[PDB]
Each structure stands twice: as C-alpha cells, then as structure tokens.
Give the backbone structure.
Amino acid sequence: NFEVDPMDESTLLYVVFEVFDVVRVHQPHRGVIEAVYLRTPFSAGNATT
Amino acid sequence: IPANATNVPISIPSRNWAAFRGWSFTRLKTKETPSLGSGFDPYFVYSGSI
Amino acid sequence: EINLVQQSMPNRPNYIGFRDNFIGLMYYNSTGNMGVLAGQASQLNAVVDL
Amino acid sequence: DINFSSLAPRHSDIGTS
Amino acid sequence: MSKEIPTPYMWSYQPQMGLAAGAAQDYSTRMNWLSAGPAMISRVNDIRAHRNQILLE
C-alpha cells in the first residue's frame, strides 16, 4: 500500500523491483554468437515473459 | 532472395552434424511473412493466408 | 440525364473469420512474450521457446 | 524433412507398490 | 578454482585443399536452461563426464 498526497492531475506510481538481469555472451566459433539471459525473481510473469 | 535474383547462396559456419536428418525448402514472399521474434510487425500489411 | 446511363458492378467478396486452428492467437516462439509453465514456488520455466 | 513421429501407443489390477 | 570438464574441441573437416587444422567446441550440446532443477543437473553433468571417458579411449 502507498499513501500519496492528492494531486489534481492523473499520475503514475513507478515501482522498480530490483533483481538480477545478467547476460552471458559466448562466440564459440567464427560468426556464431549465443546469448542466454537470466532474471530470477521475475521469470513466471511481471517481466513480459 | 532479392527481387529478380536467380540465386541465393547459403553459408553455414563449420559446426557438428551429429544426428542430422533431411532438409526441406520452399519459397515464400516477403510481404506475406511476419517475424515471430517480434510482438508486432509494423511493416506487415497483409492479412491473407500465411 | 447522363447519370441515367451509369452502371455498377458488385463489390468484391471478402470473407474475414479467424485462422485455421487459431494460429497466431497465442505467442509461440517469441522470446519477449514467452509462455510459462512452471512450478508455483520453483520459478524455473519448463517451457523455453526458441 | 517434414515427418517425424516417435510418440504413438506401444500398449486390485496391480502387482507391487 | 573450477573449470569442470569443458566441451570437447573437434577439428574441422576442411575440404581437400590444404592440410587439416583448426577446431571448435561442439554444437550438439548447447541447451535451453532455467528449466532443469538440481536432480537433473547431476544426470546432465555426469552424462557429459562419461562422454569424455569415451573420447579419451
């Protein structure tokens, strides 16, 4: 829950949920690139995925 | 395949072919094929059979 | 008296409807809109779309 | 190829558990 | 310090022109993950271990 002062304009509340977001990038041969992304607290939703 | 091109070469980097099966191929058209990596395709202006 | 001689042709048929098995009504193979089937408390996605 | 299938039926009412 | 047992290099088959050289790690071993819990990891990385024994004989 949050308590914000009343304001006449429509406003948004931006909550950043701090996580890890690490990428590992491997090129195992010439002209081959591979990338794998991990995000751990959000993986089952609230992450677009 | 560019428009009015009569050749498209493919080069695949050197990698294993362990447990490889056949190939298949067919030709499509650029205007009729959207990408599946993208959530929206602004350039896809076709609604016929894909 | 020259608009008595106008002629008219029927419009094109154009049948809309959905797609064959509802293809493209779910995201498959999008790595930005990847589906999920996972344990409730595991958070390991056992669906990884490529 | 197009084809590839390897899922098909190979098939107190119990032994031991 | 840990390195486990790396993916095994395999020399390129290069056509006929020249002499055989160069190598790169496999492309029949890379996977999707964030899917397999720790029970299946043990199997996965002792299957890999076993493979190395085969190559070393």
